[PDB]
Amino acid sequence: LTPDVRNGIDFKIADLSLADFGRKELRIAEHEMPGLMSLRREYAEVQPLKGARISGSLHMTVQTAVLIETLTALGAEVRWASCNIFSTQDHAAAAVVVGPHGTPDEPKGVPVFAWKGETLEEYWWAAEQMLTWPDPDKPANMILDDGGDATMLVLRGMQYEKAGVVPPAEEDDPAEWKVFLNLLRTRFETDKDKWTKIAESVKGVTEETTTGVLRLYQFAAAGDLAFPAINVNDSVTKSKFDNKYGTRHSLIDGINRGTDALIGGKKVLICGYGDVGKGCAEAMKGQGARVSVTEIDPINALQAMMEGFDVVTVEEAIGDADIVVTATGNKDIIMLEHIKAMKDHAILGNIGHFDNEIDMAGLERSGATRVNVKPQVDLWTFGDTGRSIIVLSEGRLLNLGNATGHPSFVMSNSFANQTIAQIELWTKNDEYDNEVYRLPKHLDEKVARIHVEALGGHLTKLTKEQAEYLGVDVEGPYKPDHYRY
Amino acid sequence: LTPDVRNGIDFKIADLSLADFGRKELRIAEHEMPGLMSLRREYAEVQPLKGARISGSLHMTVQTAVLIETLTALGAEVRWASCNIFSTQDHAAAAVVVGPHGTPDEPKGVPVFAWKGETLEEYWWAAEQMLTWPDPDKPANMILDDGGDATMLVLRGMQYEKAGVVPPAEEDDPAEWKVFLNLLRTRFETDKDKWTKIAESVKGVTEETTTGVLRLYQFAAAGDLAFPAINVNDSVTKSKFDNKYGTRHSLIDGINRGTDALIGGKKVLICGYGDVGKGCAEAMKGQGARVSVTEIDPINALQAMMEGFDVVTVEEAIGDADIVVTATGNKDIIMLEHIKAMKDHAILGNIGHFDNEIDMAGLERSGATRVNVKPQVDLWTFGDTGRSIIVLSEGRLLNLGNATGHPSFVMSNSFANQTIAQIELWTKNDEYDNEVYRLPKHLDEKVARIHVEALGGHLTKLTKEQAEYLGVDVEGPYKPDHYRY
Amino acid sequence: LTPDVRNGIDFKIADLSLADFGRKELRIAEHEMPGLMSLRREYAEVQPLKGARISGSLHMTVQTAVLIETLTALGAEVRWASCNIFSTQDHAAAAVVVGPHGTPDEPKGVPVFAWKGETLEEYWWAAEQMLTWPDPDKPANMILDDGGDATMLVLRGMQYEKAGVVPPAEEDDPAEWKVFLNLLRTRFETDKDKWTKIAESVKGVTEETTTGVLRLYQFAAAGDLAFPAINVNDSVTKSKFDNKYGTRHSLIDGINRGTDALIGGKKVLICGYGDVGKGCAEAMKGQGARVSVTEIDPINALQAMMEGFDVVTVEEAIGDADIVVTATGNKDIIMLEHIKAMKDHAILGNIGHFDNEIDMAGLERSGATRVNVKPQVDLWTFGDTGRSIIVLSEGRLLNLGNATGHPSFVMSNSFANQTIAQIELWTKNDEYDNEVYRLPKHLDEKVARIHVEALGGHLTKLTKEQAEYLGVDVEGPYKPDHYRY
Amino acid sequence: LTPDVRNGIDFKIADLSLADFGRKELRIAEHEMPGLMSLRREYAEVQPLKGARISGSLHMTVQTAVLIETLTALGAEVRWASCNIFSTQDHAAAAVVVGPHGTPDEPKGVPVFAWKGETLEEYWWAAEQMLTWPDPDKPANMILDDGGDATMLVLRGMQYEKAGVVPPAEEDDPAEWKVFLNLLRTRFETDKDKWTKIAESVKGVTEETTTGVLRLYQFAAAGDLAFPAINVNDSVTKSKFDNKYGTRHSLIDGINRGTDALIGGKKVLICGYGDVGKGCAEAMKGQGARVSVTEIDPINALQAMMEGFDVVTVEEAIGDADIVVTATGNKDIIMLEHIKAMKDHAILGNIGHFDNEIDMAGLERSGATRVNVKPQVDLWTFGDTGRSIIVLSEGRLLNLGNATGHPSFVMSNSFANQTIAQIELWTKNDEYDNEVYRLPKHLDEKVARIHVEALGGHLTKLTKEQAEYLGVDVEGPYKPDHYRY
């Protein structure tokens, strides 16, 4: 597998001719992303990202493409890869290679290695490409990460270099894990210091999602986190809006494109009642479904009950569920035994960041027979029961794999948060240690205020007197630091 | 254009190689259609529609497909066309032509004349092929109608034969009227008794939608109805389930796939607040939208206000709406003047039965320019203001044109009523006059029951004494004839 | 018992010092009842009800009071009684007796026999008083009824006078019914033609409720309906607004005041999914409850499931329900045996029309022990299991019994329909048979329209061309007769 | 005003004869307060609060009553006053002076100073009495506060005692404050070190609400806090359940008891969108209102618009509001000009904590004329407009003033938190500096888990693999410290 090179830009993507359709959709999205568009304006002269060489690992969609070009508009060079084998929107990847003023013959964009429907092998080669900058003396100096695959490939790659060996894999490590070690192994026979030099070049990572953030926290606790990290997931305008309201949008979109099943009247089981399970549950309720929820956290569970949902175990409920969704960020939610419990033609999906929430390995080793219905939609049949289950996206985040992930207006929040964090970490890199940070609240309020005004909400201004009363500035921050919204 | 013929089946569809993707989706819809399936079991042996030659004008979807193979399992012969230029699912057409145990080379299915993306001429061409059976000793004896196009063809085309002349079209009649007349005048040069003979052959029409039904009420008021009609729309289990809950599902699917625009937080205007617009509003509200409603009927309008919606006019509302949807079954709802007042990149669509709810004709002759984004998605730009509008399906039903229309389970309600009404008019024909009828209430409760059962709902049975107290039989009907549910 | 008398008016009402509080709440009511206000004005000069002598049998509330001063503003003579033992608001009883301009010592009002907390004996007495006009030779000529208690009395009163024998109550008959016959038999010592001569005098009845309406369909089915009747319940502005939305408001109010129990997070069982049951589910859902539903009718049951509720039997869900509400208008819903299976401190109430939805008689006779908490709130304990149930209003309609029933604005619909139908039967006698009737659509639309306007809803006007397209008048009704809204 | 004394217990309350009624409601509340009952078991053997003498300043409700008796099952001595002049539930205060085994002639309860409908002099007399313990060797050694009126009385009284003067108050000042200074000055004459000696034995304060916590932060910022305090408002189980789901219950209760107004279809303005405003809006939306919101915080304003609500200013929306509710915790939300702008018979209320959210000062000084309707309901007429406005509770927390405040199940949470906070600041007094503290997450989770259990929800148990996967103990806590739910 070798990159394609066209006008001095290396890339690997499905179809460059898709760039014109891409570009139309990016222009509509610009109008739905006032967060990115307002940062392109405010920061257009300052070029705060000059010198940045951002390796981005993030679903290669239309919304991402507007983030990329926000980042280039602000002075950075970028190289991109998807953080998921089914997340890439192919017209969008074409539109990024091509750039606003390029064509397929004369592209004027950025390196992108991503298409919809990678193999695990293809997936990890692209991430490597995304991370390996052309000039050996100018490696990546910034990571923009979603789920921490880029971060993991750098930190563990350096780890196994410093140790002088990449270890082999156990016959039953995840496939995903075998592939990853294999790439690391192969490159170690040829280049014995690649990741070490990258890890040393990288000045910061910015991390977009819960799963990724947890992995950061587990690196920093191991003493093994080699550069500053901003936790972008836990900006208020990210977690409470993307994880929740985005999912309220894109969960039923994904189930729609994949199955066209009526949601109304059906029994629905939502595993997890974090931000994501919250949107899931509220999306499904809005559509007339009968929803129960699973949880391990008593606080989130009591929220569910108060919100009208039975709190049940997978054990007691799975046999009656017409549609099952995992939304935990944990492993081993729906096992093979749970899948064999499900009613004929029930639907099973994962909206959590990785495929191990459902036991897809054990379903693949089970002896069930698989009939592909269409892309990312599989009928599985169990000989002993004669029942068949519809599985979405091979147990990968179904909203990005069966549809288009969250909408632009929502990613504007997330990506505005990300753009700020890239700017912050790059311009003020010396004011951070190798720990995990969150953005100051006044920046989150900046991010929300943009979207209120765009939507046409009218915020009230505190009087002199009211601000002293609440003990705040008329211009914020307006809430204590531990405030929960 | 010329029909294809494989194995003694005339037809004209996009692509026969789509048979297999069709058949897979058909077997999945059958599990979601217990109403059709129950009717297949109940009536297999009775072959109640033997000798019926059914001509069908109804959106050629996966769901319509399971209806067709229900009429054939019941003993009918059918010929099919879609009743819309954008609603055909091409894989479902392919499968209906091929049949359950046909192949694309040796089809063993039914004539179909429909593909997604027909021009107006090929629509009426298609429509005529469907009503024209081979062997003039055996024309169509049953119409299955949605919209009234098949019935309008047969009944105007008769009345133009009796007047000895097809009329000219005036300077500015709908293109669709001009193409419609074009088809009849051309036919009248070669065949002056064709529609008279076909109308004389038709034992009954069954009509599926409010628009259709109203046109039936108009033929019968003028004294032109040539055969009995069943109004299928007005079954309680069609109107209150399909029109309302189907739309609640299919409206947002249509908008999602066309635009991917966030719904949450947007101002939304639904025009009309009957069953269709009740569904729209419900669906929009459940996604976190700020909904307003227009109406002419104060009863329907008081209902909206009681549901949390502002009742407003287009005029007060139009310039602020982020999304505007017409659900009225009437014409002239969003006029060019309204379109010009819309905000930059607002989304406009029609979910009623035809394209004149929005002023498309006015749009096209206005001097705004069009840029196609993708199929059934158009950006129109007003150079004077600089503001663009995204139009959906060229103003035609957006859920069928931009997505897939209602889900199988819902259609199972409307298609069971279809099948039952075909059976009643075929088997008890002598029992009807040239009038519009509605099905007994016991049959409506029969269709509701199949679906309660299928969803796991448990009906409570009346005691003898309870049933006496209510003055109903333990088995129903349970409500007086004027009951509104 | 003996009537009071001041300034010409016989009454019997809790306490007269309460005209002040009453009058206040009554002028607040007036502002929330434009349907009544509009009617007071329109027919002000005209006095449509001149000579009419009206015997109202309907919950003596602050809304009934504004309906009464409407009927007198239109030129009628009224005699009032509550149609329920707990539903009277004693400050409104007081204000009607006293009048808009009077004193407790100098009452310018009208005759009212009712107070909160009647005995079956006092109730039926006060009913007899109400339907007992003082003068000749000029008795009751109009019954305004609710539940049909007035009409039963009169019609069976006559029925027994004709047969000679007032029959002796059987032992398994309710106490309500034993009292009823007692009352008749006593009057059938002294008077010998009381009820015959009242039945002859009565020109017609207007019946407010579903249960009353069924009793009228049963009477007319016998051939023993003695005069014309209007089914007021079955007006759209009545049934689809009062039964549904007023219950949505007044169910949770009854429960709050009775018990103050957290609704959010509780499992709740609604028996019945008609208009009432629909309003209960909605209210309970909106507060966060986990709602299930029971039904006999598969159409109503498919609606509940489509609206996100399990459809279940009492049997399967009784044992888990924190709150159980009957909304059926039938008998024998929650039997003693179901009460015994209930969880400790579960709440139980009836919102239908009488107290035999819940098997109260079976409870009283069973050996549970009643502890009164306060008026209309009883704790019942089963000593064998040790579990207690909170019973509301002794199983009488809990919303009028534990609170204030439906709000003014809602009642403004039902009562507008009541006044209009009192005008129609009074002014237009000769045009009605001894059959049950419903008001015409434009009168339904008229009521809805006043209310839409009052809430600030702006209806659209059909253009002349729109109206010919839909086959309706710009003004006249918009829907066919069988339209279900 | 002097304290009554029966059987050695000083108190001042409405009617001691209300004890029987109270005690019934208390024992029902115990079945709905598993949090409080679970601690009574866990700890009445331990006796953790032995020697605590708790001066509590907390609405004197049935719910607060079950808390008082929790604290006394755990060893505490208590003295109580209500923190609001209308928030007293007279019967519950009677029930608490009486005790579980007492009668009105032989009370066995605790001292209580509260009655619904105190004056301002009376209000602060009671607080004096609640803080003033009989033994002066043994003064109050703990405080349970709700709005910091007790904490301000003890620290603001002590600043004036170190200062050798109570300053005077000007004609322009808040009315409650002159009163507040009249008390500290009157006492200062006869007693010079009262609050100094009190400020010095108090081992710690537990603060229950937002406003009380702002004022606490205002004290500890100036180095003026003399003891270790606990912010109990900002326990997840309090803020996210009480303020939100508690208010969703008690807002509409209050408005219903005060007005009987249809909420459905009315334009409602909610001022603020924290927890309180959140619950307000959800409750009003559930009831079919058309809700708009006002905010000064861009994040909460965005959350609002994502939930379906316009985000408006008071100035732009107030002429149209049918019902106005303030929920900010801020002064000067609705001024006299705004109240003068309201339509006639619109309703206005505060649900914040103090009464200055509405400009009740200006309104009483406006020259507007007041009719009282019933307790806590006033009609204010403006002679210039002829417009009257219904104000609830004279602008004081309308949930507690017009009804009964939050339900027991909900208060069960806020109070298991206070209970635990009390136990901690008392048993483990050494660990806390003189700063504002929050409970650890493992205790919040404890509270939530008792209630999940009580409701019948089944929590899932992490396996060991998963707990490792997530980096948590199987036993919790499950979330990062900054996690917002």
Ligand SMILES: NC(=O)c1ccc[n+]([C@@H]2O[C@H](COP(=O)([O-])OP(=O)(O)OC[C@H]3O[C@@H](n4cnc5c(N)ncnc54)[C@H](O)[C@@H]3O)[C@@H](O)[C@H]2O)c1
């Ligand atoms: N698909 C998307 O568009 C999208 C968007 C945002 C986040 N995500 C991903 O979704 C996942 C959930 O994120 P979140 O923000 O909701 O995190 P969260 O931590 O707010 O919520 C997760 C919840 O799952 C629960 N949980 C853990 N193990 C469980 C088990 N065995 N059973 C039931 N519940 C369990 C926890 O108690 C918690 O409340 C993350 O992996 C995140 O990366 C995906």
Ligand SMILES: NC(=O)c1ccc[n+]([C@@H]2O[C@H](COP(=O)([O-])OP(=O)(O)OC[C@H]3O[C@@H](n4cnc5c(N)ncnc54)[C@H](O)[C@@H]3O)[C@@H](O)[C@H]2O)c1
């Ligand atoms: N009545 C009750 O039973 C009850 C229950 C809990 C809390 N409270 C009280 O309610 C009030 C709010 O509590 P909370 O937890 O919601 O606090 P919060 O901080 O969560 O919410 C208050 C919100 O109102 C906003 N606000 C401030 N000034 C404003 C203005 N001028 N206009 C519009 N919005 C403005 C702030 O942006 C904030 O988001 C407090 O005083 C609290 O003590 C009452």
Ligand SMILES: Nc1nccc2c1ncn2[C@@H]1O[C@H](CO)[C@@H](O)[C@H]1O
């Ligand atoms: N506040 C109120 N006043 C009068 C009648 C009311 C009421 N609330 C409910 N009702 C009526 O009670 C009837 C039950 O007999 C319902 O049809 C409803 O119309």
